[PDB]
Write a protein that binds this ligand. Structure first.
Ligand code: PMR
Ligand code: PMR
Ligand code: SF4
Ligand code: SF4
Ligand SMILES: [K+]
Ligand SMILES: [K+]
Lengths: 488, 417, 488, 417
């Protein structure tokens, strides 16, 4: 058993549901107990959709276990196909159904239905949401296209597929818009956007693209690899989150298409970060966490575009581990590869950053530790599915990123004043008015520690204790705290 | 839908098929706040884990109040002892939250299918501490429990831990909002009943005593097993409708006064000002709600009392009253108050039930949040069903507030258009 | 004298500076004491501009008062014209210079300069910023164009001027973008955007438009009126902030241009506000304040698009008074027309709203009173000049407005739980976790008052005391609080 | 630029023309936080009002700490008595903030041009209360004061209110950050000087006493009038450079130790560990700063000591050291420490001075925020000048922090490119 206060991903069938719902003309029969229909709320409440997910749940009860649960799923497959008349059918199990092993997928293929059937084999006790979505997306396309340079010769504009975006993905709605806009300004058309907005019929057009754009590797890397092996379609590997990343992405795609020659000031982040009110941002200590893609993106932005010092970094995407470790090594860090919330909380507590760039779950630990936080990745909740245009990708995405990642920080003048004067009745220690809300330490040692202006006090206490251990120092005093400072 | 049955002039139907309800695990969402000194550890899968945090994780928690011991491959393969694993997990949990006074091991579909004996684990764990942490067990599995039935499981688990006493006592069973709890106690004290206690309490360590001489009023309609267990310990379970609206609350209060032999002139002098003021407060909502066609989907077993209140006191017309479960003896007093020819459906086929909604096109459909927004897009006004479990709806004085919950979405419909 | 803890507007010369800086090829000689150059920071820090304002300050000192301050301004006029070589010249005074009366404007016209000269007469002790900007904009255009249907016949697309947008205006950068985008989709070209981005040469093209769009009446109403009288150019009067307002604006402009036939769902606000998680927004009590335009806009949105109950409304724009009073009358309120911050604070305190939609100054009073606040109007500071796309106008503006105006409110589940259970150790009264931060009343009476779930407790206490006075009630108790509730 | 003068091997020039500096009103921004029990009421125009809130209004204030009595037409026309008006305004202010212990009526260009006698108003108002609120006056007008000269005005106004005493006392005059204040006091106590007090204090009602036997160290270079007034009350004004960096702080501390006749072996045993550690801490910043060309525009009168520290201890090359005002006797000790042939410009012609900046293209230009971002757009790195007034820069132990303030924008330049 694994103690889990917060899970970074849902079970794999959620990933499967994300594919079916993001698409059109694709229904999903899910063998599951009564109650698993909570998943609908992920789409009706968080994604705020005005339509029921294309999912038929068998919703068996305990009384059904004394009966024919296999016949139960067969009846629901009949009903679902008859009632909804989809282009293709997903059939799968939930964690509980996986126990009773009714083989609902293979059953579906023996029922004489005249539409494509994808039988999902998702191990709910070994794999998770993103793997589920990637596997589902992969099998559906592999199943549809199995049996089965030019643009210069045809005299048409280059056309690419956008693979990856999905519901319950992070800002996929606007990332797609931003990237599509940018490609069009670079003279590059869009062929098929999938899974988000695509039908099984659209998926049949996937080989018609000149190149595949892999916006969300956690969802679409397996597919791009399969499309490359079978149809020779090359795919981009640079995810365009961040100004520099968007530039690299543009240069990469140009090569794969064979074009010639993306300016930096197309985003406002470079000027904002260069401007003098961003001077004090230099060296602010930040912890980063989330899925592989967004962590890697955030890391470069924090380090190369904002001037932060990354003091901690990790991901829950084990498939992205080697890349996060490489990035961490460049940053002089050891990468935290885990799905254990308590380990993440502990790592944050230990390095005591001034800012946490993580998931919805990092808000929990940041609240407890009193650290300014911002969400950069799923898992998320409703606040991160806003009405307004909110991409993370491209030029405008970097603009959103600048505003959102700087916002939780105390502002310049107020931070200076609190470092100067500590005896106020309103502007006290740890107060941020722009948010509109009202081994042994000597007595001498802790006095010099209270002098330290809040959010950096955590690291100071750590470094001093590390310094005191690193030497023959016993207790701690006001001088050894000043010694530790000069030492580091 | 099978052959109908007839009780108290009303029609009782049963429907089988696909269901759209919450499992009993969801009881944690309200229970962890009623009793902050308790922790709720689910033994199940990542699905169960994902459920609870998708519900309550919109809020930010400095301190964890719930969690899931997720079964791994080795657990299913029997390569790790379940009891050793539970002990280790509960061990490291009490490390992170050493202030937990009561720990609930909540059963799930996975834990109940393969029959992990959580109850014995709870017993053994309780033994290993016994001065500090109480460890208990109840099932919140979807295969066994629907939504509010989870609370019935939780309360039933506390019953054996209630002190034994033969004292005068009026026990109010079922989750009440804090100010509602205080209000009802104040009123009950005016009638001469000095000993009034609530179950569940606000602190898990401070359970009310029980035994003969204890009269129990059920504030919630979903306490079938808890009531049965309370009766097994000597308490008298008073029969009455449920304290929703003026009518229900009056009779509910009268039931206790009758059992304590309180003089009718006293209970009338006490309730009269409350009732008159309530009728006054209800008027603007009745104006909004009278003549409106209502359709309720199964969710919580609150549907029958809600329908009774909305029709009798607010003048709504009932199209269909769906319940996920119907304890006929317990709903007895409530069924007598319902208007004649009320159509009550036990169970559900969501697709066919949806067809009935669409064909009628009700003025207001009480439904879950898996259907609320999709129905709105079809031009059908909804009232999300979960709200009643998270609102102060009990008592004479809360009648207008209860009506407002249903008047609100209709009012908003007008404001926006 | 007038006690002023916070001023809603700056002196009128700031408005003049806003015109000159928003434009290009227009310099501004300002007679002012040393120190008034702080105004530069409004543009270099708040607007974050990478160029010095086209303003030459004489910056006289006390020692200069014993000398020829008139010769001082003459020298600076020579220098400014020689060095910067502008198309036209603004000449004016600050408040202090206004005392010594050097007549710098008329002086400029007698110095033999061969460019247009606008002599600004701004009464710093009677008028304020917006009047200053409107007057400056009016005189410059009146001076440029004084000496001096068709689109169907020419066979071209209708073209309109966008008049009003300016630096230190509220989200003018993106409002212009949004409106220009929307007009183009409706087949309507842009002729001249002014003052923001326009040169004196551009202003000469103002009569070439088929209609004038008055986006910011506080800045451009006087001008549109002058353009209408002299060149027959009609102008729109509906400011497109809000979904319904944008629709009305589109219908209005179509009439003035003579076109035929703007759908509602082009913004996401209608669905978001219609969706069930907005149910609890119904009747939330809101106070509104700011300049006339944004107050009028916010009022309709709060009342007709969000379902709030407006319990207080006012403006500091006295020129907009009769309109705000008319709007207040429809809302059953008396409009607060004042520039006195203490009066605004008092009005908020008295009606005890759940949300304040005001200026930067309302954040001050909301902080003290513990009320959720959002900025909808100038005066503003740097937070409201963000890097990301942030219009208030048009379809996307309504999206931004929905996110921003709902954000300060406690969220649904948490608000319900605090109404249910009041004895928590973390989720206490008045706590909002999504922000990530940890005549006589009887003892019986105050107990029933504490039952009231926070943000609405203020109004409850008022209504109960009003109820107790309204009757023969003495003291107050738990029952009279319940009586007051049923009474209202 | 006129004919040069020569002092201590350095060149002193004077330039007339357009200025870009803050008026003395801006002193309120830091003073209101040094002394939270004080209120700062400006008597001036809406321009003055707009200035202060454009500065400090980025922060959100539950309680107002400053404000402006804005002159109206009737005031200028003499149709309302200025003294009656002031009294009424001060009256209604103490209604909103009844906890104010000291009220500063701050003069502005309008109030000083027409010569409203605020000083007598302050006297009369002080009389009408005298047990509760002290009302004082100083000028922060642009025509008279530049930036930090406002503090000189404020401190000078407190001097007559300082108690009279002939006790042993070391007075530290000028705004120090709280931890810097405490640090310097701790060090001074190690030398045997038991009585060390700060002016200004943290509470306006608790002013240090003064008289003969009081030795005064000036921590800030802009206290010309305050020092003169302190001397008029019997105190000895010690001459020394200003406590910026190791060199300046050492000599500053030595000045007080010499006056108190502290034995040199004691002051060396006390300062040695501090100095050695400081040299160690300074090294990485020196590496960043050595050989860099520096250009400072007039702002605060901190420019000379800053230039002295950055060249002597950080190895920067000085192109031009601009000051808005130069008290030559007060900068005496500081001018002796400056490297030979330093180009110092008193006054300013901002356009011509800009040309000198552009023609040299310095590695780092210390300038105001009216020029900072525009210079950055021209590819010239800046260090915004205001920061030094809002940073803990004084003392041996703060040398590295002071250097970091100038190393930071250069470091950021590298990180971003
Ligand atoms: C009155 C004009 C004005 C404007 C528009 C700003 C904006 C601004 N001032 Mg401020 N500032 C103004 C004035 C002043 N500032 C002052 C001080 C100050 C400090 C220490 C700081 C600051 C800052 C700002 C900032 C950056 C936003 C912030 O973090 O506060 C703006 C837009 C902020 C910064 O990063 O500067 C580079 C910061 O640390 N100001 C002072 C000292 C008396 C004055 C008169
Ligand atoms: C597990 C699925 C799920 C999702 C995605 C949401 C989203 C959501 N739930 Mg919630 N909610 C879920 C489950 C539950 N909710 C529950 C309760 C609840 C309440 C009282 C409320 C709420 C709300 C929400 C909301 C609206 C956002 C908010 O204000 O919290 C989302 C997106 C919120 C609301 O406005 O509903 C219409 C509100 O008042 N939920 C319960 C009770 C046991 C469960 C199991
Ligand atoms: S207990 Fe059953 S119905 Fe509930 S979340 Fe777990 S698997 Fe789903
Ligand atoms: S005192 Fe003078 S320089 Fe300062 S803001 Fe007022 S008018 Fe301007
Ligand atoms: K795991
Ligand atoms: K006024």
């Amino acid at each position: 058993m694994e103690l889990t206060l917060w899970t970074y991903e849902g079970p794999p069938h959620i990933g499967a549901m994300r594919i079916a719902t993001s698409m059109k003309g694709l229904h999903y029969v899910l063998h599951a107990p009564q109650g698993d229909t909570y998943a609908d709320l992920l789409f009706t409440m968080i994604e705020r959709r005005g339509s029921r997910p294309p999912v038929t749940y068998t919703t068996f009860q305990a009384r059904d276990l004394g009966g024919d649960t296999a016949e139960l799923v067969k009846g629901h497959i009949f009903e679902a196909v008859e009632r909804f008349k989809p282009e293709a059918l997903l059939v799968g199990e939930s964690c509980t159904a996986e126990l009773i092993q009714d083989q609902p997928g293979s059953l579906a293929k023996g029922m004489g239905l005249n539409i494509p059937i994808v039988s999902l084999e998702l191990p709910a006790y070994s794999k998770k949401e993103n793997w589920g979505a990637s596997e589902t997306f992969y099998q559906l396309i592999r199943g549809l296209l199995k049996e089965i340079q030019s643009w210069q010769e045809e005299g048409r504009r280059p056309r690419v597929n956008l693979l990856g975006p999905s519901l319950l993905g992070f800002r996929c709605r606007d990332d797609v818009l931003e990237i599509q806009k940018i490609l069009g300004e670079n003279g590059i058309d869009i062929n098929v956007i999938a899974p988000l907005g695509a039908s099984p019929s659209d998926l049949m057009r996937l080989p018609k693209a000149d190149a595949n754009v892999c916006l969300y590797p956690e969802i679409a890397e397996s597919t791009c690899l399969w499309l490359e092996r079978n149809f020779k379609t090359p795919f981009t590997k640079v995810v365009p989150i961040g100004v520099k990343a968007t530039q690299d992405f543009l240069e990469e795609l140009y090569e794969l298409l064979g074009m010639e020659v993306s300016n930096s000031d197309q985003s406002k982040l470079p000027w904002y970060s260069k401007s003098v009110d961003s001077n004090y941002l230099t060296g602010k200590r930040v912890f980063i966490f989330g899925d592989g893609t967004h962590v890697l993106a955030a890391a470069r932005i924090a380090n190369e575009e904002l001037g932060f010092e990354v003091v901690g970094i990790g991901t829950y995407s084990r498939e992205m581990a080697r890349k996060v470790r490489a990035a961490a090594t460049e940053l002089g860090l050891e990468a935290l590869i885990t799905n254990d919330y308590l380990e993440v909380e502990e790592s944050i507590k230990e390095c005591a950053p001034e800012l946490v760039l993580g998931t919805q779950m990092e808000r929990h630990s940041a609240k407890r530790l009193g650290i300014p936080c911002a969400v950069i990745s799923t898992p998320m909740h409703v606040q991160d599915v806003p009405a307004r245009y909110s991409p993370q990708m491209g030029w405008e995405g970097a603009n959103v990123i600048f505003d959102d990642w700087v916002h939780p920080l105390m502002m310049g003048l107020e931070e200076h004043l609190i470092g100067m004067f500590r005896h106020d009745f309103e502007f006290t220690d740890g107060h941020q008015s722009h948010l509109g809300h009202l081994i042994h330490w000597t007595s001498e040692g802790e006095s010099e520690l209270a002098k330290i202006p809040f959010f950096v006090r955590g690291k100071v206490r750590r470094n001093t204790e590390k310094y005191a251990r690193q030497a023959g120092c016993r207790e701690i005093d006001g001088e050894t705290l000043l010694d530790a400072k000069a030492h580091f | 839908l099978g052959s109908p049955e007839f009780m108290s002039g009303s029609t009782l139907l049963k429907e089988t098929g696909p269901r759209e309800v919450f499992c009993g695990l969801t009881s944690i969402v309200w229970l962890h706040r009623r009793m902050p000194d308790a922790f709720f550890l689910v033994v199940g899968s990542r699905t169960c884990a994902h459920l609870i945090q998708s519900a309550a994780g919109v809020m930010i928690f400095a301190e964890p109040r719930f969690g899931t011991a997720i079964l791994e491959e080795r657990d299913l393969a029997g390569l790790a002892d379940a009891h050793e694993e539970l002990d280790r997990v509960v061990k490291s949990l009490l490390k992170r939250r050493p202030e937990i006074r009561t720990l609930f091991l909540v059963g799930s579909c996975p834990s109940e299918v393969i029959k992990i004996d959580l109850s014995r684990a709870a017993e053994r764990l309780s033994s290993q501490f016994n001065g500090q942490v109480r460890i208990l067990n109840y099932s919140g599995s979807g295969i066994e429990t629907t939504f509010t039935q989870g609370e019935d499981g939780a309360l039933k688990a506390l019953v054996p831990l209630m002190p034994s006493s033969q004292e005068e006592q009026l026990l109010l069973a079922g989750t009440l909002a804090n100010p509602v709890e205080d209000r009802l106690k104040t009123i009950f004290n005016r009638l001469g009943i000095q000993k009034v206690e609530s179950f569940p309490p606000r602190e898990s360590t401070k359970l009310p005593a029980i035994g003969p001489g204890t009269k129990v009023l059920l504030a919630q309609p979903y306490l079938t097993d808890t009531a049965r267990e309370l009766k097994d310990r000597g308490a008298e379970i008073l029969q009455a409708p449920f304290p929703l609206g003026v009518e229900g609350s009056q009779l509910w209060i009268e039931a206790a006064a009758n059992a304590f032999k309180i003089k009718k002139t006293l209970v009338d002098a006490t309730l009269e000002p409350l009732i008159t003021r309530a009728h006054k407060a209800l008027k603007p909502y009745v104006e909004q709600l009278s003549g409106k066609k209502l359709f309720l989907l199964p969710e919580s077993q609150l549907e029958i009392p809600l329908a009774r209140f909305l029709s009798n006191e607010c003048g709504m017309k009932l199209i269909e009253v769906g319940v996920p479960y119907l304890n006929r003896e317990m709903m007895g007093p409530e069924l007598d108050l319902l208007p004649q020819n009320t159509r009550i459906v036990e169970g559900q086929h969501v697709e066919k039930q949806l067809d009935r909604v669409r064909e009628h096109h009700p003025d207001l459909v009480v439904c879950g949040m898996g259907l609320a927004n999709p129905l709105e897009a079809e031009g059908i006004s909804t009232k999300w069903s979960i709200e009643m479990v998270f609102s102060p709806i009990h008592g004479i004085d809360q009648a207008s507030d209860l009506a407002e919950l249903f008047a609100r979405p209709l009012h908003r419909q007008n404001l926006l258009n």
